[PDB]
Write a protein that binds this ligand. Structure first.
Ligand SMILES: Nc1ncnc2c1ncn2[C@@H]1O[C@H](COP(=O)(O)CP(=O)(O)OP(=O)(O)O)[C@@H](O)[C@H]1O
Ligand SMILES: Nc1ncnc2c1ncn2[C@@H]1O[C@H](COP(=O)(O)CP(=O)(O)OP(=O)(O)O)[C@@H](O)[C@H]1O
Ligand SMILES: [Mg+2]
Ligand SMILES: [Mg+2]
Lengths: 289, 284
């Protein structure tokens, strides 16, 4: 129904409009790629966009929606950064053909009625301080997937637990979509890019390099075992000024009811002032490579 | 390589991936996929759903047969007649039967699930608080596996039908939900596999549910209270019928409007057998 100008950025706010356009495109043979974001786009988001872009004959749909359901009480929702103008400009510069920018009313016309209940993983790690956070994420992603019906959906490895939960959602509900995890984009010194980084002042920005330095040190110390790996990361974090560690955990790659055996993920969350930063890295125990 | 599909014949698939591939292939050939979810032990009521699906032009009918463990209260006793069920489908001209195992549907146990809205805790949700989460979770999965153009459910389980409409709207599902009128025995009793459990006196008293509903529907020209009182009087004239609820709601099961369309629902226990029924009501 709505107009679609190829080669140009087409912005649709109505779920029905992007649904009709996606369907039409899909019918002509083009493969639909979906990159779900909450706006305030930076180089990390662009890596996802570029990963989607390189899929042969694909049309990229980037959704921008600050999902109220994944925010807990507080001014977290009001505090989330919003920079619409820069966002669309960057999408246009990346050659993205579709931006989906829905209203809260169009996504939640009936408030929170039917929702997604994540499995046990949602209550741990990031879910500890926010028991309802991932139910909000999976509910909106399921909706986005039903609206856009993409062949592949892209998520960053930076938010590893979120990526694992999306894989669980897709597997558990038999969703016909491929989940593509994209490697974390980092600043020159290793800091994982994140919109929350804008809240780090000069001193905090300097100290924040400790998360990634700790993780990479652990990844290399891992030839000596799990204890060596964790102790190396702890030492780096402990030597960092003003870094308060929330958690530092080594888990199996699925983060589930499975012990660590050889391959794993080391995850860290720490507070620098009021800014909570996260990072994670692949870990191989007893492997020199 | 797409699994084999023989047109005009009943094709049975147990693997979710197989029916998924066949459904996708058929949709591309210009067929409209119709889904009729069941738990087997098929009777005339189920056949009405099948016939509703069959009459859609270009239809290819998929009937799923899966005893869903998640919708059973805190399973083995449930009746299972594979051969006879399949025979009825073949006689109806159904081309696809999807018969997955529990392990195939829940390869990871109960992990991610559907949390229904608050309507799921009312009416039937009173005695079985987790029943509808089970129903919506398995229906979402079946919809994703089969990707039908339309899905059919009987009006007999009206609350179930309404919650599935909520599921579809809330998750932006691209499928039409079709409610099919309740098939009834000669005296009005809603057909149900559990009716066989009623002894003679119970089966005779059971006519009270449908008689109470139809009486209420006609009494409705006199108002909502008149409709409710008429239904209660009919249920009150029957022995051994323990009414759990008799409620008049709007068609989406919210509060009944001053006037207009509504739905009257009843549930009662006769011995150890629980029966339910419901009917459209027009107030005034
Ligand atoms: N540095 C990075 N490298 C790769 N992917 C990244 C990334 N930063 C974010 N992403 C991915 O981009 C997607 C959208 O992220 P958002 O949820 O919009 C917030 P954010 O960009 O992660 O920052 P914030 O939580 O600090 O505000 C997610 O799938 C996320 O994992
Ligand atoms: N008499 C009837 N008329 C129309 N649809 C009916 C019906 N009885 C059942 N159905 C529909 O058939 C589908 C399968 O439901 P089932 O529970 O598996 C059969 P059932 O007869 O309701 O068994 P039950 O007595 O164990 O509850 C549902 O969509 C249900 O509403
Ligand atoms: Mg983030
Ligand atoms: Mg039933």
């Amino acid at each position: 129904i709505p107009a679609f100008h190829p080669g140009e950025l087409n912005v649709y706010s109505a779920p029905g409009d992007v649904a009709d356009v996606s369907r039409a495109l899909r019918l002509t043979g083009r493969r639909v790629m979906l990159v779900p974001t909450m706006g305030a786009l930076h180089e990390g988001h662009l890596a996802l966009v570029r990963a989607a872009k390189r899929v042969p004959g694909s049309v990229v749909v980037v959704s921008i929606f600050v999902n109220p359901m994944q925010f807990g009480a507080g001014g977290d929702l009001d505090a989330y950064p919003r920079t619409p103008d820069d966002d669309l400009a960057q999408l246009r510069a990346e050659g993205v053909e579709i931006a989906f920018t829905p209203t809260t009313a169009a996504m939640y016309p009936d408030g929170l009625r039917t929702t997604v209940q994540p499995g046990p993983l949602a209550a741990e790690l990031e879910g500890g301080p926010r028991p309802t956070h991932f139910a909000g994420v999976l509910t909106v992603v399921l909706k986005l997937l039903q609206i856009v019906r993409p062949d592949r959906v892209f998520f960053g490895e930076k938010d590893y637990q979120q990526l694992v939960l999306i894989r669980q959602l897709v597997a558990d509900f038999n969703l016909d979509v491929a989940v593509v995890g994209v490697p974390t984009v980092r600043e020159a010194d290793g800091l994982a890019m994140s919109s929350r980084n804008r809240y780090l002042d000069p001193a905090q920005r300097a100290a924040a390099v400790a998360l990634s330095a700790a993780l990479t040190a652990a990844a290399h110390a891992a030839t000596a075992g799990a204890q060596a790996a964790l102790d190396a990361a702890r030492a780096v974090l402990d030597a960092a000024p003003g870094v308060a560690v929330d958690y530092l955990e080594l888990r199996d790659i699925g983060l589930g009811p499975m012990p660590l055996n050889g391959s794993g993920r080391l995850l860290v969350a720490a507070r620098l002032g009021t800014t909570r930063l996260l990072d994670n890295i692949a870990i191989e125990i007893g492997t020199f490579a």
